[PDB]
Design an enzyme around this catalytic site. Sequence first.
Site, short mmCIF file in Angstrom:
data_model
loop_
_atom_site.label_atom_id
_atom_site.label_comp_id
_atom_site.label_asym_id
_atom_site.label_seq_id
_atom_site.Cartn_x
_atom_site.Cartn_y
_atom_site.Cartn_z
N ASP A 39 41.35 85.73 16.62
CA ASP A 39 40.26 85.19 15.82
C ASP A 39 39.79 83.86 16.43
O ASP A 39 39.85 83.69 17.65
CB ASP A 39 40.74 85.08 14.35
CG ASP A 39 39.61 85.22 13.34
OD1 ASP A 39 38.79 84.27 13.26
OD2 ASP A 39 39.56 86.24 12.62
N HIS A 69 37.43 80.39 10.06
CA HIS A 69 37.61 81.82 9.78
C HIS A 69 39.03 82.29 10.11
O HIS A 69 39.68 82.97 9.30
CB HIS A 69 36.53 82.57 10.58
CG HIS A 69 36.50 84.04 10.39
ND1 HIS A 69 37.22 84.90 11.18
CD2 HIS A 69 35.77 84.83 9.56
CE1 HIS A 69 36.95 86.15 10.84
NE2 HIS A 69 36.07 86.13 9.86
N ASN A 161 30.69 94.58 8.05
CA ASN A 161 29.99 94.09 6.87
C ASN A 161 28.52 94.51 6.83
O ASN A 161 27.68 93.76 6.34
CB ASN A 161 30.08 92.58 6.79
CG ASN A 161 31.49 92.04 6.75
OD1 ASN A 161 32.44 92.66 6.28
ND2 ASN A 161 31.61 90.83 7.19
#
Length: 279
Positions: A39, A69, A161
């Site tokens: 990440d 995040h 998403n």
Amino acid sequence: AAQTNAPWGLARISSTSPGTSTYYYDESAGQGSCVYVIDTGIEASHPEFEGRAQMVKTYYYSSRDGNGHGTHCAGTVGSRTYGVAKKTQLFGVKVLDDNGSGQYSTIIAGMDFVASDKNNRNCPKGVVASLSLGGGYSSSVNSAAARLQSSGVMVAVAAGNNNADARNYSPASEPSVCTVGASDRYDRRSSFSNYGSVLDIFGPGTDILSTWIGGSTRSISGTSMATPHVAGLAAYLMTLGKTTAASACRYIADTANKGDLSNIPFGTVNLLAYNNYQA
Ligand SMILES: O=[Se](=O)([O-])[O-]
Ligand SMILES: [Ca+2]
């Protein structure tokens, strides 16, 4: 063990019903397992990680999470308050820059890094990788995720998403990993969650409280938030000896709460991650 006034998603993964606020789990808590969070990095100094998080790799000028995040995702895996597997070891691999973006070539290098680096770590109960990231379909990204899984790591990836079929996104579309959709606190499919035949499981993804940079906390939403619930659950179940890295996604699907989500399109699994913890 019982954590009162837990984030709703933690309570959800130890419940056969929505609408409760206590997380119940075995005290082993993922001890002896490892979860790589691939990440934007992890703020390992956050008190919530208790010294159990560390950065192991970056492809940029710092290993610091300048975004938040990756810290949020790591917190859902393994922080003391916000995490599923409260005693796991967390390893950060910074493939995403501080704007949250990363080239697929860097993401691929980071996956092959984890497949090797686990041989440098002590993870007697097993190894998980959480990938709250993705872009458009790429056979090379999918192949990297497949290799990581083949190497003996439980790979959990975000479905995406786009409120669309995950078949057009990577690494979501790689069949051999665990592709995770998002739900909300009322057991609805999250409005943004991708769907499709390639999804393996849903986890909590709308309004998820976790760690943030600067020693803080915040609530955000995404399949990025659902993924670390599943990664932490895998680590937890592996520590219990219930399953293995190769079999954990299937085990989680076997043992999930079934049929309880709304607005699941025809042909997508209706399965919500569940720890089946009985005291
Ligand atoms: O219910 Se929660 O976890 O405060 O949003
Ligand atoms: Ca799969």
